[PDB]
Amino acid sequence: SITKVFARTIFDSRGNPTVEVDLYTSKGLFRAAVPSGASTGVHEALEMRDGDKSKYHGKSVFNAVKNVNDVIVPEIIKSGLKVTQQKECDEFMCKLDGTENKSSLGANAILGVSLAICKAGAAELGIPLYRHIANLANYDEVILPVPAFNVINGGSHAGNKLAMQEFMILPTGATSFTEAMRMGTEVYHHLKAVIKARFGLDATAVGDEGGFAPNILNNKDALDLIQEAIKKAGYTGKIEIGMDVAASEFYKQNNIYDLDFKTANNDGSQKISGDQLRDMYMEFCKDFPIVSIEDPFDQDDWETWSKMTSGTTIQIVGDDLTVTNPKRITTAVEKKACKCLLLKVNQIGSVTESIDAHLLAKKNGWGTMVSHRSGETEDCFIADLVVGLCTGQIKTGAPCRSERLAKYNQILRIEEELGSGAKFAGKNFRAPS
Amino acid sequence: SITKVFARTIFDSRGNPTVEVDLYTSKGLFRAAVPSGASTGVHEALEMRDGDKSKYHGKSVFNAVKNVNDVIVPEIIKSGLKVTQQKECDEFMCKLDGTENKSSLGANAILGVSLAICKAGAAELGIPLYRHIANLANYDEVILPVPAFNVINGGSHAGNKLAMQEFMILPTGATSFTEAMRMGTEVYHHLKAVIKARFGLDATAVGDEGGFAPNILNNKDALDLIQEAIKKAGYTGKIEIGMDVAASEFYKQNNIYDLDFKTANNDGSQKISGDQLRDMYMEFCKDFPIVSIEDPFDQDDWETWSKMTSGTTIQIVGDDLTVTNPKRITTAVEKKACKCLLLKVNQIGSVTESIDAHLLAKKNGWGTMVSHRSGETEDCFIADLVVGLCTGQIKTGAPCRSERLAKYNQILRIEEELGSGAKFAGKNFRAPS
């Protein structure tokens, strides 16, 4: 039974406030922190912000904290639900909220308690959190994921001329997670050495996810830069590439995508149509070892999504397209729009829903890439979520900044626990099962 | 009694490996991580690195981990020392090493165990870690520190033309730590809004400590930029400024300091003498609310250190000068070279030594600023160290990046524990006692 639930505000990796929940049972204290969400979102659960422009730039979360403290806490304690009853606790809070998007109490309020309950339930059962999540999703075995390291950025996420938002390296050729960390960091540092030489030390500064953002003129340069880094590290072949086009951010209208949206009066050549964009991806896939492309088209340009998923054999990740929303996931499934779900727990708002969202994707053949948010905390819950859900792939930032490393370090700790019987997703990261 | 000590490698905020120690008593697991140190250092305890150029860029720590695992662990367990005996445990390990600079086992090996033991001892006594450190240093009361937020960088730590390495804001006018976080972050975000407008979004990228590094031409511009930010935030007067000149990095010879060292063939005006440099500080102190200047002169230019400490009334912090080394601290005390010790636990290598180093400074009238390292971890131990040592001031990075926020969040948690009786150092941060 839950004896006490208490929320407070802490600060995320970007200096913004966020909810942190302290939950007690006779086993003790179980702390959980919520990552940056969307106060306003397309189909995602809405995180509650105070909006007071004076206070913390309108990003304070006193209202969400209040909701946890004098609404959720009293109710859930009086409910008499055990931390061992995840589904029920989460349903309770959902009933308590009463809205589809959790806008009455705030997804950040509901998720904080939900994560704490999950950690508590695991303790209640005397098993590790990953094992607990495994059992919740009905998995008998667990597998260590291949890390998708963010290394170079673009789009709205930086200046430069890069249209594509993210460029990541996946150590699929590694034999273990330890080796994956070794490969990932070595390349990161080799990439930094390459970037500082080609663009100067100022280009060595990092963004929200710990990746670099040199003033690269084109997407191909980004890829070549990564290639050189992989070469210097001596891992060509063992390391593959992933991308997050986030084409939604750069879609004009009627099948038009402007690869140069970052300029006023864009009357240049990079104002191509979706079909031309799709071909560009095909060209990239031919020359570069690209094994995964996230959000290649607009979140509503279904037709081109299906065309690309139909003829490429690589992983096509849905993010803005699916927003960890079962309704959106179903549609993408029916339309065969993609083959991988980017799982963001705070996008849906609760642990069981996140698990169900994943199970839905899997049931229909998709892979699942567990994802972090731009505003993370020192909480490493998703590290246990990716191992327990047996997804084989997690995208939790570059191996720089501790809100990123917090997760990777945890997975290293889990790998240690599993011992020799620790399975690394490797090449079959897409669906290790 | 210690039943089990186990080390492993994790990654710091910069992607480099570092030691993490797991220690067990009948109370359970107590985990501690060590921050980036100096493999080779002036007078500081030497952190052990493998140096294998192929493996992790020569920055791996398998040797230190090995030292903990099959040398320290067996010995300390067989010694029969309680985690409650900090001084003795630390002396034991020091005896075990046998060197002044801990170069036989590695300061990073010894400190990891030392931090774990400390957390365990606190648990053994049933008190919070801060309270435990307070009792270890003989303090009856504790006080929340004024955060010294790194906001703009320069020197070798970035490109640009800034000679001074760090520029920090200290919310001395705050009433509580909560308010200090509010002020600090609001200014941080206002500073970002100012920087992106004046220098573009690319200048918004951050460095190791989460601070910005725009291509600022001169030190005064840095100060004015901060001033504007403080103004926009509406905290002029409640927020003061600190600096870390790190003049050691920019000293030529015979009383010569080149404010433009970042250029080959520096035959320009900024090749001034220490006395001219000292005057420059005096000018800065007159116009700007600078309340603390760290490493204003070379780590061996004692004479100018004393001259400045003698005639300024502001805080003069010793870092490279003192390197948390009692011998160096004594000399600076005798010569009245400075009035504040920058405390870096991993620079000396153990918890009791760090405490003694602090007590030494205090005994002689100095203040103590608890410091983080460029390569931090998600460990928040120093947050408890600064509160327990009643120093009133901690320098643990900008309110950006979770290896920085990890500490600040912890202090927010401690503040919550103390309640209304939570004292904030405020204006008397220099020596709140």
From Swiss-Prot, chains A, B:
One of its GO terms (cellular component) is phosphopyruvate hydratase complex. The keyword Cytoplasm applies. (2R)-2-phosphoglycerate binds at S36, H157, K344, R373, S374. InterPro entries: Enolase, Enolase-like_C_sf, Enolase-like_N, Enolase_C, Enolase_CS, Enolase_N. It is found in: Cytoplasm. Its cofactor is Mg(2+). Mg(2+) is required for catalysis and for stabilizing the dimer. Crystallized with Mn(2+). Homodimer. This is Enolase.
